[PDB]
Design a protein around this ligand. Structure first.
Ligand SMILES: Cc1cccc(C(=O)NCC(=O)O)c1
Length: 165
């Protein structure tokens, strides 16, 4: 199971780790992907998770979009976790770099409440442009299920822990 996590609250845990490496080690029931509405897994967490599946996540995602159309910003879909997890919960946080409403970050985190335990990144953080400190705050105040957050960047991880209220 999950190891080396710092407990932030009753249900939120955090670790400085590569979420792909964490997923391959733990093989969690759910790994969260930092998805976009098109499920185009190009960069950041999505690109890394997809590359770890040898592009199987993208092929499956393209079939999902062909059938269902794009997701909503703040929405999610459950697809296969491939070699990383039982399932992948593709969650679309607002992309501040595309001018999307940061208020949708709480709706995006609400998707985590449908799963008892998840391995996840900070939504809308990184290349999505939102403040990761704010993302962690929204996570703690929204997610009630057990969430194990993997923060890739060491300097950000240190700042997140040291500033956590
Ligand atoms: C280097 C940098 C700048 C701004 C934001 C971030 C960030 O939220 N990263 C997420 C993560 O490392 O898991 C990193």
């Amino acid at each position: 199971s999950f190891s080396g996590y710092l407990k932030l609250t009753d249900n939120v845990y955090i670790k400085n780790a590569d979420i792909v490496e964490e997923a391959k080690k733990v093989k969690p029931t759910v790994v969260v992907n930092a998805a976009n509405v098109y499920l185009k897994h190009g960069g950041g967490v999505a690109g890394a998770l997809n590359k770890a599946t040898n592009n199987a996540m993208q092929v499956e995602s393209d079939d999902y979009i062909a059938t269902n159309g794009p997701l909503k910003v703040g929405g999610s879909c459950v697809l296969s976790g491939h070699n990383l997890a039982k399932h992948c919960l593709h969650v679309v946080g607002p992309n501040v770099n595309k001018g999307e409403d940061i208020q949708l970050l709480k709706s995006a985190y609400e998707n985590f409440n449908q799963h008892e335990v998840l391995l996840a990144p900070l939504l809308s953080a990184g290349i999505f442009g939102a403040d990761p400190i704010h993302s962690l705050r929204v996570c703690v105040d929204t997610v009630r299920t057990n969430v194990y957050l993997a923060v890739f960047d060491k300097n950000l991880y240190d700042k997140l822990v040291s500033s956590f209220l």
